[PDB]
């Protein structure tokens, strides 16, 4: 249990993610969390995140004064490091990041790092004087105080972000700190699984659990958890006719093979009819959502009763409407986990890599990948182009080397846009720098095998400022 | 001068260009032209082009039988080498693709030493050369890759030296010209002198009318006329569908160089005329009608004019009396005459731009707002290409505006055969810079894409 004190950094969640990837359960709390509330979880260590505001800004979150006095090991990152200096007798003086090389990095905190240590430095403000007794353990060419450490090696501050990719050796730094903090590592995959099975069993007991399955690894792993736990359940797969080619069969075949009670609902006509004449994306998503709860509710009524409704709510969600007649008790086993941790559970639960390592697919499926009204003919064309794109990516082994890959159909008689992105911070996304020979092969095969498509293009837009999906 | 006998090959025009690139003038005549029409051109050599038919097909183009005895040095390519073999005692049987010549000898392969990749024709094959002829070239699969007559004046090759896929093809054709003693009569200073002389004697003191579009061809036609001292009226019709700053740059340059220029402000006409039309076909038709209406209006209003000068080019060949001094030239040769006529590189090395202008680069109806958005994006794309030295490295670069709120498609192509076009393999870092620069300076554009479609199966322009 490591508490990440959130002082506003866009990377606060990422820090919480690195601690999980380092087998330390982590929880996030507001920076100005009262000492009692932060102590109630009995945390082994505290990590003070960076923040967009200055240590002088009146509207800047301050921790609980008594915080720095808990023998509790501490790691202040940027803003966090500054609060350390300021509230312990050091000197801080006067918002953007930038790459820099540490010209010096000594002590246990940098134990193991050799060669060049590039770090993602924060440039708002600076510690010019470490707290009395503390030592400067790192610096860059421009900043003589890049990192500080108390004489007993319990508290450390760094002027850079070891949690971001721009600090390639950051994970080693974070490791050193956990050891130095005496943080026990009780967040391993087998432990989580055993723990989750236990909880699902006690919670649901002899009662029945209802849940929606979309084919995504999250809901698929949730179904496998319930089935493995031996809890009575019904997994419902709503086939809105907006899926990729062969997806329904693939998902139903595998989940049944692994023993989940599955019900596939054919609602293709329902959704298509409901989408007729609709071009507005937000409208499409509202209608799709509406039609889904309606078909799902019908299942819940005919196959009821159901005491629990299980959902794949993840930790990022926690950090962030069924009909009247239906009333369930929420069962969210993954609410404290990150997706990759769920993907690991899937491996432990036996999900074949075919369904375990696929890219995310939106609830509205292909309806938001057709620019303009969704018709069956358009979906038919798009599905074939998409299927060809996906397949070529796999053949070259590029499918697993991008975070997302999709095709968008624009009526004009059709232009198809290939869209692939990669990501290093799980917030931004760059258009994928794919081999041009691959893009050429994709375009030729598509226009050749799908005569309706007369032109293929590749999206060169990143996130920001655009979205991954086109609508 | 070197004559090219056309037996139907899609590369015939290409054979003609290559010869020009070897500073030898060349003309194309039907492969069946009589030996009389062939000789009136006083050819120093002859090249028999390939063809899509077999020398056995009953409808296969046949040359004048007297040709093979005319004494003219000749080079038969593919189907042409077949004719040669057949019509002289050789044997041909019913048998493209990259291939390596495992053997080559003689003057036709001088300097070719090493690997020689050729673009083979596999329609038929010469199994036995004419009596007394030598087999000077071979491929691992074709024992008869090329043949040479005893007097060393005739040759046949089973591959296409005129296409890039035959890297050392130009050297082969060069060797042929050297063998045949062809004189290098195709230099721009000579051509220009000839053209000035010709236009001056045709125009006399009559008035010559001609439309200038900003394109190097029409700009060079204007400079030729001005340099010849001909009485002319160059009409620049500003239809408001041009690139940013074009009219100002074109008129300032042409007038500074001597041209008698008349710029016409017909922006409203075209814009108005284009209201609500999305059909690409209608757009082109409408714009074409509007241009004629504006040009004719100026014609009736001045002069009068006896001659109408047009920049018709050789590939085009392949109330007024027309005057097309460039009908035997290729675009590049005109860009060269422009050099000789003092046209500054700024207006001499630009990519082609269509008559319909930016109208065909907007997927939908042309409105001034869309024109202003596209115009700015295009300008940015263009400048970035110039800044990075990539502009002259593509055959065409354009941007297409698509309403979605607009998605902009960047489109660039390269070409090796002046018939096919590949989407340009530009550096991805450059594409990223163009995409970021465009979305940042042109807020209305929320997304930038790159066209990955070659020709075939698609066109260079989107509509």
């Amino acid at each position: 249990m490591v508490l990440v004190l959130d002082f506003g950094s866009q990377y606060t969640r990422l820090i919480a993610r690195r601690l999980r990837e380092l087998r330390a359960f982590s929880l996030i709390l507001p920076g100005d969390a009262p000492l009692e509330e932060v102590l109630k979880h009995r945390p082994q260590a505290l990590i003070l995140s960076g923040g967009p505001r200055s240590v002088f800004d009146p509207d800047a979150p301050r921790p609980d004064p008594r915080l720095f006095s808990s023998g509790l090991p501490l790691l202040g990152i940027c803003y966090g490091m500054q609060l350390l200096a300021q509230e312990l007798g050091g000197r801080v003086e006067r918002a953007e990041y930038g790459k820099a090389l540490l010209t010096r990095h000594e002590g246990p905190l940098f134990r193991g790092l050799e060669g060049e240590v590039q770090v993602w430095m924060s440039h708002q403000d600076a510690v010019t004087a470490p707290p009395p007794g503390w030592r400067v353990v790192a610096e860059t060419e421009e900043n003589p105080v890049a990192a500080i450490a108390s004489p007993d090696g319990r508290a450390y501050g760094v002027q850079f972000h070891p949690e971001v990719a721009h600090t390639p050796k950051g994970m080693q730094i974070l490791e050193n700190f956990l050891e130095l903090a005496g943080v026990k590592r009780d967040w391993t995959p087998e432990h989580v699984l055993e723990e989750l099975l236990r909880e699902v069993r006690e919670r649901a007991g002899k009662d029945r659990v209802l849940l929606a399955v979309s084919g995504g690894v999250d809901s698929s792993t949730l179904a496998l958890l319930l089935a493995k736990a031996g809890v009575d359940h019904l997994a419902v797969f709503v086939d809105h006719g907006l899926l990729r080619l062969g997806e329904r069969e693939e998902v139903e075949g595998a989940l049944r093979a692994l023993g989940v009670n599955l019900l596939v609902v054919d609602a293709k006509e329902r959704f298509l009819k409901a989408l007729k004449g609709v071009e507005d994306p937000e409208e499409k998503r509202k209608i799709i959502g509406r039609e889904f709860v309606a078909a799902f509710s019908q299942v819940a009524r005919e196959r009821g009763p159901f005491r629990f409704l299980a959902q794949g709510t993840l930790y990022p969600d926690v950090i962030e409407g069924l009909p009247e007649d239906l009333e369930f008790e929420l069962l969210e086993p993954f609410r404290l986990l990150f997706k990759d941790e769920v993907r690991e559970l899937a491996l432990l639960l036996g999900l074949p890599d075919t369904l375990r390592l696929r890219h995310p697919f939106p609830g509205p499926g292909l309806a938001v990948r057709v620019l303009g009204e969704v018709t069956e003919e358009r979906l038919e064309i798009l599905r074939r182009a998409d299927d060809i794109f996906t397949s070529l990516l796999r053949e070259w082994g590029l499918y697993e080397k991008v975070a997302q890959a999709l095709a968008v159909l624009t009526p004009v008689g059709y232009v198809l846009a290939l869209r692939a992105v990669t990501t290093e911070d799980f917030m931004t996304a760059d258009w994928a720098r794919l081999p041009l020979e691959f893009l050429d092969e994709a375009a030729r095969r598509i226009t050749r095998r799908v005569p309706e498509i007369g032109r293929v293009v590749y999206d060169l837009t990143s996130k920001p400022p655009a979205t991954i999906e086109w609508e």
Side-chain angles (χ1 to χ4, degrees), chain A:
Chain A
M1 171 45 223
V2 175
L3 204 303
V4 172
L5 286 171
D6 181 29
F7 291 104
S9 174
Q10 58 173 300
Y11 306 120
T12 296
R13 190 164 57 70
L14 181 53
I15 297 171
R17 188 196 277 273
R18 302 311 189 194
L19 296 174
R20 301 304 185 81
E21 309 186 319
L22 291 177
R23 329 306 198 244
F25 183 59
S26 61
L27 227 49
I28 292 175
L29 257 68
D32 58 52
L35 180 64
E36 278 59 63
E37 172 169 46
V38 316
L39 292 174
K40 56 192 290 292
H41 292 67
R42 205 293 178 296
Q44 285 191 296
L46 303 167
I47 291 188
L48 294 73
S49 84
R53 295 170 177 173
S54 174
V55 204
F56 307 118
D57 191 307
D59 302 61
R62 310 290 306 178
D64 184 300
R66 297 171 298 172
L67 192 64
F68 299 110
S69 296
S70 62
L72 282 184
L74 305 171
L75 174 60
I77 296 175
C78 297
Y79 180 83
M81 170 175 139
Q82 309 180 316
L83 283 170
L84 243 321
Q86 174 190 60
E87 266 188 20
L88 287 176
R91 179 179 287 81
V92 174
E93 288 176 35
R94 268 186 162 298
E96 50 170 49
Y97 312 117
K99 306 181 180 183
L101 303 180
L102 296 177
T103 56
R104 186 163 71 78
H105 42 272
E106 28 208 53
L109 182 70
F110 293 101
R111 182 188 171 217
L113 288 71
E114 304 304 330
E116 65 157 44
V117 184
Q118 172 181 290
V119 299
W120 193 229
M121 296 281 287
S122 179
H123 294 151
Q124 210 173 67
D125 309 337
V127 174
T128 54
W134 291 42
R135 33 174 147 289
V136 173
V137 292
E139 47 197 64
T140 64
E141 235 308 300
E142 238 67 299
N143 184 331
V145 184
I148 59 174
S150 65
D152 64 353
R154 175 154 48 60
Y156 301 83
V158 298
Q159 188 64 62
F160 52 84
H161 293 274
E163 72 278 28
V164 86
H166 292 302
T167 300
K169 298 172 180 168
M171 289 300 283
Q172 292 176 55
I173 294 173
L174 290 177
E175 242 272 72
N176 293 169
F177 173 69
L178 290 176
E179 302 179 51
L180 296 173
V183 169
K184 100 286 185 177
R185 312 304 180 66
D186 297 319
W187 190 260
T188 62
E190 61 253 72
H191 173 67
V192 176
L193 182 54
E194 293 170 54
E195 194 176 67
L196 297 186
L197 282 165
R198 186 193 310 120
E199 304 188 308
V200 176
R201 280 167 188 153
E202 292 190 60
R203 191 69 184 294
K206 318 297 287 62
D207 298 300
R208 200 171 170 63
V209 184
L210 172 74
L211 77 155
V213 155
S214 68
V217 70
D218 189 333
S219 70
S220 283
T221 307
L222 184 41
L224 269 41
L225 183 65
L226 299 171
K228 185 65 178 56
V231 319
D232 184 38
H233 69 282
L234 176 69
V236 174
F237 189 73
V238 181
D239 189 335
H240 50 197
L242 307 175
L243 299 166
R244 287 159 168 285
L245 211 52
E247 171 154 33
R248 175 184 67 79
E249 300 190 300
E250 271 186 58
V251 174
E252 83 184 315
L255 298 183
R256 290 207 160 107
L258 284 169
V260 328
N261 303 315
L262 180 74
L263 194 203
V264 181
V265 178
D266 185 335
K268 299 184 182 182
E269 298 311 307
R270 184 171 182 164
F271 283 80
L272 182 63
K273 201 194 306 297
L275 286 172
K276 187 173 176 55
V278 190
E279 293 70 56
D280 181 68
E282 190 164 56
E283 189 56 61
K284 291 181 177 180
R285 288 174 185 274
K286 293 299 176 60
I287 290 179
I288 299 305
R290 182 171 56 62
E291 292 302 315
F292 182 87
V293 304
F296 187 60
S297 294
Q298 199 171 68
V299 169
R301 282 189 281 260
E302 309 175 313
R303 285 188 160 59
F306 289 108
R307 181 186 170 188
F308 297 108
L309 169 63
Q311 305 194 312
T313 306
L314 304 181
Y315 195 46
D317 301 300
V318 171
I319 296 305
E320 293 293 357
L322 291 181
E324 296 186 59
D325 61 299
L326 301 176
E327 286 191 55
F328 306 112
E329 192 180 309
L330 268 181
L331 176 55
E332 309 176 306
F334 305 154
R335 68 182 302 281
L336 300 185
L337 284 51
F338 283 101
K339 181 167 285 180
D340 44 37
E341 173 70 358
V342 172
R343 211 176 291 275
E344 169 62 13
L345 291 184
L347 169 53
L348 281 48
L349 289 173
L351 190 67
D353 289 344
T354 53
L355 290 307
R356 196 179 78 84
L357 307 175
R358 66 197 310 84
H359 300 143
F361 192 66
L366 297 187
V368 292
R369 292 186 183 166
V370 173
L371 272 57
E373 170 185 45
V374 171
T375 71
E376 186 48 50
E377 177 191 350
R378 294 179 165 185
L379 287 170
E380 195 282 313
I381 296 166
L382 178 57
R383 285 196 299 255
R384 286 187 286 145
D386 174 84
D387 174 68
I388 288 178
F389 181 40
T390 286
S391 295
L392 286 175
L393 281 168
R394 290 188 202 279
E395 164 164 42
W396 300 64
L398 293 167
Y399 186 93
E400 309 192 306
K401 300 184 191 188
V402 295
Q404 175 69 88
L406 56 92
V408 171
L409 180 62
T410 300
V412 180
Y414 292 100
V415 176
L416 188 97
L418 301 175
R419 212 283 191 274
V421 297
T422 55
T423 176
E424 289 75 57
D425 65 1
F426 316 96
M427 300 180 103
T428 58
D430 302 314
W431 59 276
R433 303 303 169 91
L434 289 171
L436 292 183
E437 189 285 325
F438 168 76
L439 295 182
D440 177 70
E441 187 183 56
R444 285 182 300 147
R445 191 157 313 186
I446 289 175
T447 55
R448 166 179 174 175
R449 313 283 217 297
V450 187
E452 300 89 324
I453 299 301
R455 214 174 274 281
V456 178
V457 303
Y458 188 46
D459 198 332
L460 302 171
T461 319
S462 289
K463 174 186 169 169
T467 48
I468 299 175
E469 293 286 343
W470 279 38
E471 58 170 51

